[PDB]
Each structure stands twice: as C-alpha cells, then as structure tokens.
Design a protein around this ligand. Structure first.
Ligand SMILES: *[C@@H]1O[C@H](CO)[C@@H](O[C@@H]2O[C@H](CO)[C@@H](O)[C@H](O)[C@H]2NC(C)=O)[C@H](O)[C@H]1NC(C)=O
Ligand SMILES: *[C@@H]1O[C@H](CO)[C@@H](O[C@@H]2O[C@H](CO)[C@@H](O)[C@H](O)[C@H]2NC(C)=O)[C@H](O)[C@H]1NC(C)=O
Ligand SMILES: *[C@@H]1O[C@H](CO)[C@@H](O[C@@H]2O[C@H](CO)[C@@H](O)[C@H](O)[C@H]2NC(C)=O)[C@H](O)[C@H]1NC(C)=O
Ligand SMILES: *[C@@H]1O[C@H](CO)[C@@H](O[C@@H]2O[C@H](CO)[C@@H](O)[C@H](O)[C@H]2NC(C)=O)[C@H](O)[C@H]1NC(C)=O
Ligand SMILES: *[C@@H]1O[C@H](CO)[C@@H](O[C@@H]2O[C@H](CO)[C@@H](O)[C@H](O)[C@H]2NC(C)=O)[C@H](O)[C@H]1NC(C)=O
Ligand SMILES: *[C@@H]1O[C@H](CO)[C@@H](O[C@@H]2O[C@H](CO)[C@@H](O)[C@H](O)[C@H]2NC(C)=O)[C@H](O)[C@H]1NC(C)=O
Ligand SMILES: *[C@@H]1O[C@H](CO)[C@@H](O[C@@H]2O[C@H](CO)[C@@H](O)[C@H](O)[C@H]2NC(C)=O)[C@H](O)[C@H]1NC(C)=O
Ligand SMILES: *[C@@H]1O[C@H](CO)[C@@H](O)[C@H](O)[C@H]1NC(C)=O
Ligand SMILES: *[C@@H]1O[C@H](CO)[C@@H](O)[C@H](O)[C@H]1NC(C)=O
Ligand SMILES: *[C@@H]1O[C@H](CO)[C@@H](O)[C@H](O)[C@H]1NC(C)=O
Ligand SMILES: *[C@@H]1O[C@H](CO)[C@@H](O)[C@H](O)[C@H]1NC(C)=O
Ligand SMILES: *[C@@H]1O[C@H](CO)[C@@H](O)[C@H](O)[C@H]1NC(C)=O
Ligand SMILES: *[C@@H]1O[C@H](CO)[C@@H](O)[C@H](O)[C@H]1NC(C)=O
Lengths: 420, 88, 50, 198
C-alpha cells in the first residue's frame, strides 16, 4: 500500500477561543543508548605468520605495518574506559538511602538495589541483563570497571536524587522531603505548587502504576534492546569475517602456511608467501579501519549519554523533547550491558475545555493585564487562571497590573475589578 | 587477577583511589621500604544522608571558585605532495 | 600434517570413517592416529602478552 | 601536566609524520630502497619490475596516512564544534544547563587563547555551610492554608519563618510572602501557626 503519515486533524481556531486542560497524567518513558563496546586486541605477527620464523624473516621488509595496528587498537581500548568513566563517575561520594522508606507514598522498591541477591542489582536492571545475550592472536581484554562498580554508581546516583534533589550535584547533598522536592519540580514547569499537595495521593498512584507497567513492557517484549544488541552483533560479525579470511589462497597454491613450507624449496617459497602476506595485510587494514570508524561513532554516543545524564538526572531540564515527550520532571538511570537506560518521568496534560478569552479588561478607562495567567470566561463571568491547569479565581487588583488606557488595545472587553 | 597473573607486586587489603589501572577493578600504585602494591580500587568515600520527612538543610554561606577547562580547537596545517614523494 | 600443540585424549565423537576434524578456520582440531585407532585432540600452546 | 589534551594532538601529528618519513627506508621486496641505486645498475626491462614494488608500497603508505588524518580531523572538528557552543553560551550569556560551564551554579566565564586551543576560566557559586531545620509544606491559620510564594517554611525550634531556598535569610510570615488556597484539611503535614496581617 501507500504509507499514511498520521490521522488527519484540524483545530478549531478563532480569534477568541482557548483550550485549558483540567487534569494531568504522569507518564514514564524509557531511553536506551550504548556507551562502550568490546575491547579487542590483535597480534599482527601471530595472525599473519603463525609461529614461522621463515615467514617472520619476510614481512620485515614492509617496515612498520605491524606497530601502527597495535597502536590504533590500544588507542581504542583506552578510549573505551574513558567513555565509561566519564559516563558513570559523575558523583564524588557514595550515598545510600535510609533504612526507612517514607517517601510520601511513592514506591521506589523496583529500582532500588536488592540486598537479598548476591549482586547488588535491582529488579529492572536484572531484567535488562537477562534480555541481552579466538586462538589466532585475537584476544579480548576485560573492562576496568566491573558490573558491580557500575551498579554501585547508579545506586549512589539514585540515592542522591531521591534524598537530596539536585543539591548533590552543585555542592554537598542537602536532605529534603520528597513531597517538597516534587513541589519544587512542579514549580519549575509553571504549575502552582498547591496542585501537588492537593493531589498527592493521585499522583503517587499514577507513578506507581506507570513504574509497574514498565516491568510488563520490558519483561514480555525483547525487541526494545535492539539498539544495544546490534553493537554486539556487528562486532561479532566483523571478528567472524576476520577469522574467515584465513581460509583464502589469494593466488597461492595453498591457504595454510605449513604445507607451503613443508612442500616447496626455500628459493621459490617466497613467491607464494608474499602473496599470502599481502592478502592478510589488506584484510587486517580493512578490519582496523572499520573498527576505528565504529569507535568514532561510539564516542559521540557516549558523549551524548554523559550530557543527558548531567542535564537530566542531576537537575531539571527545560529543553523540549530532550528528556521525553511532555514536561520533564525527573529521571532514574539504570545500568545495562554496554549501555545505560533512563526512565524519564514526564508531566502530560489531560482533558481540556473550551473557553473565551480577552487580552485585557476595561474598568475605568484603564487596561488591566494579568501578572501571570490568562483571562477566561465560562459564558457569564470572567476569571483569571494559570495557563497549564484550570483553576479560576476572581479578578482583583492583586492579579492584574494597570498599564495605559482602553483606546489602544485590540479586543479589550468590559468588566469590573474587585478591590480588596 | 581476573585478567592474568601479576608477579612482582604485593597484594594489599586496603582500598585507595588508584593510579595505574590493570583490569577487572584492580589497580597498582607505588607506596612505602618502597614497593609496588596491587589492591582493589576504591570508587569513593562512603556517606549516608540523614533523611527524614520533616527535616531540611539550608546553606548559610557561600564561596566563589574559578575552574579551568582546556580543549583543543585546531590541528597542524600539513600538506603532502604525491608525485614528489613516490617518484621524486 | 605438521604443527605444534598438546595431544590431549578426547572422545570427540565416533568418527566411524573420518580422519580429520576442522573448525571455523582451516585448523585441524582433532586427528585420528595412523598407527592405532584413537581420536586425539589438538590444542595450541599458551599465548598471551607481557 | 594540565595541558595534556593539547600536547597529545601535537605528539600524534609528529609521530604520524615521523612514521610516514620512516617508511621511505623499506625494500618492499626489491633489491634496494633507493630509486637512483636501482636506476644506475639495471636495464629498464627489469628496472620497471623492481620499481613497481616500491611504487605500490609507497602508495599504500600514503593511503594509510591520509585515512588516519581524515579520521583525526573529524574528531578535531567535533571538539571545535563543542568549543564554539561553549563560547556562545557560557561567555556571551549565563547558562542554566547543569555541569556545562563548571561545577556549581554558573556566573560568568573568560576566554583565553592557547596553542591550537582555547582555555576558559569558569566562575561558579558554591554553598558552604549548612544547618538543620524543621520544615512544613503549609500553614493553617483560620481553616485556610497559606503556601509560600517563592520561599520555604523553616523553624529554628520555637518560631516559624519563610526563607529563600538557596541562602538562609529568615523573615516573618505575612500575607505578602504567602498565598491562600483552599482549606487546611487536605494537605498532609500542615502545621498550626498565625500569619501576621500588616
Ligand atoms: C484526573 O484523571 C484521573 C485519572 O486519569 C482521575 O482519577 C480517577 O478517578 C476515577 C473517578 O471516577 C476513579 O475511578 C479512578 O480510579 C481514578 N484513577 C486513578 C489513577 O486514581 C481523576 O478523577 C481526574 N480528575 C478529576 C478532577 O476528575
Ligand atoms: C512497592 O511495590 C512492591 C511490588 O509491587 C510491593 O511489594 C509487594 O507487596 C505485596 C503486599 O501488598 C506483596 O503481596 C508482594 O509480594 C510484594 N512484591 C514484591 C516484589 O515484594 C511493596 O509493598 C510496595 N511498597 C509499599 C510501601 O507498599
Ligand atoms: C459561570 O461561572 C459562574 C461563577 O461560578 C457561575 O455562577 C454561579 O453558578 C452556580 C451554579 O452553577 C451558582 O450556584 C452560583 O451562585 C453562581 N455564582 C454567582 C456569583 O452568581 C455561572 O453559573 C457559570 N455559568 C455557567 C453557564 O455554568
Ligand atoms: C465598554 O464600556 C465603555 C464605557 O462604559 C463603552 O464606551 C462607550 O462608547 C460609545 C461609543 O462611542 C459611547 O457612545 C458611550 O458613551 C461609551 N460609554 C460611556 C459610559 O461613555 C464601550 O462601548 C463598552 N464596550 C463594550 C464592548 O461593551
Ligand atoms: C562566610 O565564609 C567566609 C569565608 O568562606 C567568611 O570569611 C572569612 O571570615 C573569617 C572569620 O573568622 C576571616 O578570618 C577570613 O579572613 C574571612 N575570609 C575572607 C575571604 O574574607 C565569612 O566570615 C563567612 N560568613 C559568616 C556569616 O560566617
Ligand atoms: C528562634 O528565633 C526566634 C526569633 O528570633 C528567637 O526569639 C528571639 O530570641 C532572642 C534570644 O536572644 C530574644 O532576645 C528575642 O526577644 C526573641 N524574639 C521573640 C519574638 O521572642 C528564638 O530564641 C529562636 N530560638 C532558638 C532556639 O534559637
Ligand atoms: C490546629 O488547631 C485546630 C483547632 O483550631 C485543631 O483542631 C482540633 O483537633 C482536635 C483533635 O481532634 C479536636 O478535638 C478539636 O475539636 C479541633 N478543633 C476544631 C476547632 O476543630 C488541630 O488539631 C490543630 N492541629 C495540630 C497539628 O495541632
Ligand atoms: C471544543 O470545541 C471544539 C470545536 O468547537 C470541539 O471539537 C471540542 O470537542 C470541544 N471540546 C470539548 C471538551 O467539548
Ligand atoms: C474576531 O473574528 C470575527 C470573525 O469571525 C470578527 O467578526 C470579530 O470582529 C473579531 N474580533 C476580534 C477582537 O478580533
Ligand atoms: C586480607 O584479609 C584476608 C581475610 O579477610 C586474609 O585471608 C588475607 O591473608 C589478607 N591479605 C594479606 C595480604 O594479608
Ligand atoms: C602395525 O600396526 C598395527 C597397529 O596395532 C600393529 O597391530 C601391527 O603389529 C604393526 N605391525 C608392525 C610390523 O609393526
Ligand atoms: C543534621 O542532623 C544530622 C542527623 O540528625 C547530622 O548527621 C548532621 O551533621 C546535622 N547537620 C549539621 C549541620 O549539624
Ligand atoms: C513523619 O514520619 C513520622 C514517623 O517517624 C510520623 O510520625 C509523622 O507523622 C510524619 N510526618 C509527616 C508530615 O509525614
């Protein structure tokens, strides 16, 4: 068929008509992106001329075609550790949550570490680890940071975020009740803080439901971790092709160097040996170049990860769609094989209503404008309310400020302003 | 070690912010009778914040600090002739 | 069939009529003795780095 | 050792050029690594045979050098773009992004030049000395619930004050620091007190 871009929609636009939501909805998204890849190492002499001094006498006229490959591979290997360190080692001290979890009704038991398990990993990251799945001079070095240290870092980060807000990233951690922190976070998106206090139980229930639905979204469908799985698939395929390149003649009489050495006289063995050496040199050069490019892209991905952790976990962000669709509230990092997982908690508006607006109001020839908010009308009376949540109030001289007269503004209306 | 076997350095039960990485969370350092030690790296000083539902900590003073960030912007303006290099 | 390694004794399979055993690369993994009839296993010597 | 980032760029370029130069002293399979030595000893039918190998080797060396230079130049371009962004935001303005222009709250920055680089001196604000306090989300006065406008309610132990969240500076609670919203039987943790009317 022919693809459809979406469902058609036309908004009801007019010069005096606004839609203000009367409710909200807390949603928890998920962002997955890789951080580091496998640190491999290849020995050029063992790969090309396997333990054969006759072949090692050759390949020495080519100069320094063997040290540059080792230097590049070592550079990539030491770059991976820097990537991981700069992504995760953002905190200076190691905080821990108090033994009593009085967080105002919110329930973080699913993301906090579990002491019962031998490894101090939470439930979500255990699901993440369960959802993700030689002798020719090729070796695989172990990473500097074992998974336990990564888990300790992400636990310290969660304990700091929960118990101190954003104050643990600037100076020293300052304790604060979780309800007050959430009120500050609503205050940061233009919603009055009293909304949280008046709807705390509802917000807590919605958050718990979303964090519960995350488990069902993850543990059932395994197609989410493809962005992390393809990195491993690509590396395993590149290594497999490199291994498979040793079974090629490249024009010689045999693809194995021992039969050639045990079958031909010394004066004319070099004729076949040089062709074999050239073929294997080209195969190594291509593999090294591909690895360099892949590591170059992985570095950019890791830099994006570090920036997003800094600007999204350690403090609230005002950049649109940087931390999920909707107004951003807070995020929780989770470790994963060769990557990190963010759980963005966002504020999404809900059921809305039509109203009738006016730029200003004439009282005694003066023009009153709202300090913060918008004038609305349900049909008979005029009210002033905040822009992101329907909360009508009487229009007084404490909600509006006077500026100018009535004969300039286009669309001004008539009403009375109560004087307290 | 989980990476290999290390000879010439003595194991130490302590834990410090490590200097020379080795692998699998093990580092080496030069310390005091001088010798090279190999320990398990320490990833930070342990801390616990006194959290309760009606307690807040507000700073009463500040301090001004000047940090430094150094980052490169350009590289050498090299140019190589081809014919003169190969068949000069 | 030249080469170096350690000749461990392994019961890889029956090998009712076969002699050689191969891997992903052109590497003889297991060989059958020519004098007697047993299935030897080839493992290369130790590699590494300093 | 502070300027290692700029020193590695120089060292890497120097070593790349040094390796390119060192590649001129390789036989590559011929009898000599000098074109004149071959040209003064052999006839052209075999001189061409002995020269093709040198041509191939030097061409491969040049190709490798050019590819590595291209990759390194791309990395340097990414770093330069980051530096340009930092100059646009930290210096020509004030940045609200966390940990972008230094640890702590950002105030201002000054640029300084460096060989093949640039240096920033970020000035930041850091809180120093803390004190424990008892807090409360709201205050019920006459059934009404007063919430702070742009502050936080604290209590030294007997009295209640409203102060800004980043610097302890207590003030008497009045009708100018707080706004009324609803009744005081819904909020969890509200505290009885009196709000002064000026
Ligand atoms: C705002 O929306 C929420 C849910 O989207 C409403 O909460 C639901 O209220 C109904 C009452 O008819 C209950 O049956 C549901 O169990 C509630 N859901 C949850 C998750 O608590 C809420 O009532 C809406 N606000 C208003 C003012 O109507
Ligand atoms: C936070 O959520 C967890 C899991 O949803 C709750 O633990 C469950 O508690 C019920 C009792 O109501 C048990 O029947 C389940 O077996 C528990 N599940 C697990 C995995 O332990 C926990 O109670 C919630 N926190 C609070 C404060 O209620
Ligand atoms: C528009 O809002 C005004 C203000 O609330 C409404 O006037 C009130 O209406 C209710 C009935 O819903 C009465 O009980 C109140 O006594 C009215 N207040 C006053 C001051 O008269 C008005 O009804 C609303 N209009 C519509 C169409 O719903
Ligand atoms: C809003 O009120 C003002 C004054 O109350 C109205 O101004 C009137 O304008 C007409 C047109 O010239 C004059 O003939 C009247 O004398 C004015 N009123 C007075 C009291 O002087 C204005 O028309 C009103 N606008 C709306 C939309 O109601
Ligand atoms: C806030 O901290 C500053 C320093 O961080 C204090 O200034 C110092 O005060 C001591 C008093 O014992 C003097 O000896 C120092 O010379 C001062 N330093 C400077 C740079 O002036 C300041 O007193 C503190 N303020 C309060 C109210 O405690
Ligand atoms: C909490 O703050 C109040 C307000 O300043 C303190 O009350 C004052 O205490 C001083 C003590 O030197 C008296 O001289 C004042 O007369 C008090 N003012 C009033 C209005 O009573 C109170 O002492 C403080 N409490 C603590 C424990 O420091
Ligand atoms: C704040 O003061 C009100 C009274 O103004 C207290 O309400 C009283 O609560 C007791 C205990 O249930 C009742 O016996 C009284 O009848 C209530 N008084 C009224 C007028 O309703 C309230 O408990 C106080 N809050 C705190 C935290 O002490
Ligand atoms: C608001 O008006 C538009 C068009 O007049 C209509 O499509 C929409 O359903 C209305 N909203 C509500 C909540 O009735
Ligand atoms: C709004 O648009 C209508 C056309 O539907 C027009 O008659 C009216 O004068 C306009 N009023 C303002 C204030 O723009
Ligand atoms: C470190 O402590 C363990 C017991 O916890 C002990 O067995 C071991 O010998 C100690 N290491 C050294 C070097 O003494
Ligand atoms: C040859 O090898 C077989 C293998 O077992 C053995 O039985 C036989 O005696 C051998 N013959 C000679 C002459 O060595
Ligand atoms: C605040 O109280 C906690 C425990 O109640 C204590 O650990 C901390 O040192 C106190 N802070 C100050 C500044 O005294
Ligand atoms: C805080 O927790 C204590 C339990 O130690 C409880 O008695 C008190 O009522 C709680 N206060 C608030 C405001 O949640």
């Amino acid at each position: 068929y022919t693809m459809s871009l979406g469902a058609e929609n036309s908004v009801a636009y007019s010069n005096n008509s606004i839609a203000i939501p009367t409710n909200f909805t807390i949603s928890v998204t998920t962002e997955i992106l890789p951080v580091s890849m496998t640190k491999t190492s290849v020995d050029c002499t063992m790969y090309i001329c396997g333990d054969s001094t006759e072949c090692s006498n050759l390949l020495l006229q080519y100069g320094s075609f063997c040290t540059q490959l080792n230097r590049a591979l070592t550079g990539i290997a030491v770059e991976q550790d820097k990537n991981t360190q700069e992504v995760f080692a953002q905190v200076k001290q190691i905080y821990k949550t108090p033994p009593i979890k009085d967080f105002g009704g919110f329930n973080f038991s699913q993301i906090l570490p579990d002491p019962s398990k031998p490894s101090k990993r939470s439930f979500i990251e255990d699901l993440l680890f369960n959802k993700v799945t030689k002798f020719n001079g090729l070796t695989v070095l172990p990473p500097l940071l074992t998974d336990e240290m990564i888990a300790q870092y992400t636990s310290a980060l969660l304990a700091g975020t929960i118990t101190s807000g954003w104050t643990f990233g600037a100076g020293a951690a300052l304790q604060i009740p979780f309800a007050m922190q959430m009120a500050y976070r609503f205050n940061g998106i233009g919603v009055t803080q009293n909304v949280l206090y008046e709807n705390q139980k509802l917000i807590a229930n919605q958050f718990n439901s979303a964090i519960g639905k995350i488990q069902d979204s993850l543990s059932s469908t395994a197609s989410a971790l493809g962005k992390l799985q393809n990195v491993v698939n690509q590396n395993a395929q590149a290594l497999n092709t490199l291994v498979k390149q040793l079974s090629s003649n490249f024009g010689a009489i045999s693809s194995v160097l021992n039969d050639i050495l045990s079958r031909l006289d010394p004066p004319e063995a070099e004729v076949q040996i040089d062709r074999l050496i050239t073929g294997r040199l080209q195969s190594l050069q291509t593999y090294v170049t591909q690895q360099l490019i892949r590591a170059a892209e992985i570095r950019a991905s890791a830099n994006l990860a570090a920036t997003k952790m800094s600007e999204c976990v350690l403090g609230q962000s005002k950049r649109v769609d940087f931390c999920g669709k909707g107004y951003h509230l807070m995020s929780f990092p989770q470790s994963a094989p060769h990557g990190v997982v963010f759980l963005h908690v966002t504020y999404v508006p809900a059921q809305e209503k039509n109203f009738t607006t006016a730029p200003a109001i004439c009282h005694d020839g003066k023009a009153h404008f709202p300090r913060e908010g918008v004038f609305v009308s349900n049909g008979t009376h005029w009210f002033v309310t905040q822009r992101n949540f329907y909360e009508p109030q009487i229009i007084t001289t404490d909600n509006t400020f006077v500026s100018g007269n009535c004969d300039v503004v286009i669309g001004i209306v008539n009403n009375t302003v109560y004087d307290p | 070690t989980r990476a290999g076997c290390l000879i010439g350095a003595e194991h130490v039960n302590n834990s410090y912010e490590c200097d020379i990485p080795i692998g699998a969370g093990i580092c080496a350092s030069y310390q005091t009778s001088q010798s090279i030690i190999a320990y398990t790296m320490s990833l930070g000083a342990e801390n616990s914040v006194a959290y309760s539902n009606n307690s807040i900590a507000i700073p009463t003073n500040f301090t001004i600090s000047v940090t430094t960030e150094i980052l490169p912007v350009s590289m050498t303006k090299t140019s190589v002739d081809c014919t003169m290099y190969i068949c000069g | 069939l030249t080469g170096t390694g350690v000749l461990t004794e392994s019961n890889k399979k029956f090998l009712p009529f076969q002699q050689f055993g191969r891997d992903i690369a052109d590497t003889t993994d297991a060989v059958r003795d020519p004098q007697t009839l047993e299935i030897l296993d080839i493992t290369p010597c130790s590699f590494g780095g300093v």
